[PDB]
Design a protein around this ligand. Structure first.
Ligand SMILES: COc1ccc(Cc2sc(N)nc2C(=O)O)cc1
Ligand SMILES: [Zn+2]
Ligand SMILES: [Zn+2]
Length: 231
C-alpha cells in the first residue's frame, strides 16, 4: 500500500517499488503551516541509479540517499530536477556533497537563482520549446509547456510505461488547485494534452504529491485547473 502523509514523519523517506528497477520516493515537509507529502523517482541506469527530484529539503534528501543505500545498494550518480521549487531542488547541495551530478533545464536554473533556491550544476540542452524531449540514460525527459510552472518537466520510463508528472499532475483526492503562484493556468490544460499526446501508452502516472494512477490523472488535473480559471 502506498504511503500517505500521515505515516511519514518529517525527516524520513520511503521507497516504493513501481516496476522492475523503478521506485518512487516519498517524503513530507511543512509549507505555509501544514505538512504535505511529495514524490520523486528513482530509475536504475545500468549499474547506477538516476534520481528524479530531491526529497524536498536537505534533511529529507540525506535520508533518501541513505534509504537508497540500504534498500537498493547501487550508487546514485545523476539527478534531474523537474522545476525550480524547493520540493524539486531543495537538497541539491547535499546531493552535490554526496557526489551526485545534478542537472536541470537552463530555465529551471535561472529561476532557482531568482528565488534564492539551490541551483543544479549542469544545464540540460534541448528542452527549450514546448514539445522538446531528450534521452537521459534510461528515461526520456519531456517539456510539455507551462503548467504548474513555466519550466516544469515530466519524465517517462520507456521500459516500464511509467510517467512522472511532477507537480503538473494532481492526485484524484486533490480537488483544490492549491498554490499556483508561478503557474500559467492558461496554457496548463494544453500542456496536459501535450502529455497525453506524446505518452498515450503510460500504464502508470505519478503526480508530484500523493497517490499514483493511470492516464485519468491527466484529465482530473485539467478539470481542477478549469474549475479555478472560472472561479
Ligand atoms: C496532495 O496534497 C497536497 C496538497 C497541497 C500541496 C501544495 C504544495 S506544497 C509543495 N512543495 N508543492 C505543492 C503543490 O501543489 O505542487 C501539495 C500536496
Ligand atoms: Zn512546484
Ligand atoms: Zn509541488
Amino acid at each position: 500500500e502506498y504511503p500517505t502523509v500521515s505515516e511519514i514523519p518529517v525527516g524520513e523517506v520511503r521507497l516504493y517499488q513501481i516496476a522492475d528497477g523503478v521506485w518512487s520516493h516519498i517524503a513530507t515537509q511543512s509549507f505555509d503551516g501544514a505538512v504535505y507529502p511529495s514524490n520523486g523517482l528513482i530509475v536504475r541506469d545500468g549499474d547506477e541509479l538516476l534520481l528524479i527530484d530531491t526529497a524536498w529539503g536537505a534533511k529529507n534528501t540525506a535520508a533518501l540517499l541513505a534509504e537508497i543505500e540500504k534498500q537498493i545498494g547501487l550508487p546514485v550518480t545523476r539527478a534531474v530536477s523537474t522545476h525550480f521549487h524547493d520540493d524539486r531542488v531543495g537538497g541539491v547541495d547535499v546531493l552535490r556533497a554526496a557526489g551526485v551530478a545534478t542537472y536541470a533545464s537552463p530555465s529551471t536554473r535561472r529561476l532557482a537563482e531568482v528565488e534564492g533556491n539551490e541551483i543544479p550544476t549542469h544545464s540540460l540542452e534541448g528542452l527549450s520549446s514546448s514539445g522538446d524531449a531528450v534521452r537521459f540514460g534510461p528515461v526520456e525527459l519531456f517539456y510539455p509547456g507551462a503548467a504548474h510552472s513555466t519550466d516544469n518537466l515530466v519524465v517517462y520510463v520507456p521500459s516500464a510505461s511509467v510517467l512522472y508528472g511532477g507537480c503538473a499532475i494532481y492526485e484524484l483526492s486533490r480537488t483544490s488547485a492549491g498554490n499556483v503562484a508561478d503557474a500559467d493556468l492558461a496554457e496548463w490544460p494544453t500542456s496536459i494534452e501535450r502529455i497525453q499526446q506524446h505518452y498515450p501508452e503510460a500504464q502508470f502516472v505519478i503526480p508530484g504529491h500523493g497517490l499514483p494512477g493511470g492516464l485519468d490523472l491527466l484529465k482530473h488535473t485539467t478539470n481542477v485547473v478549469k474549475a479555478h480559471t472560472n472561479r
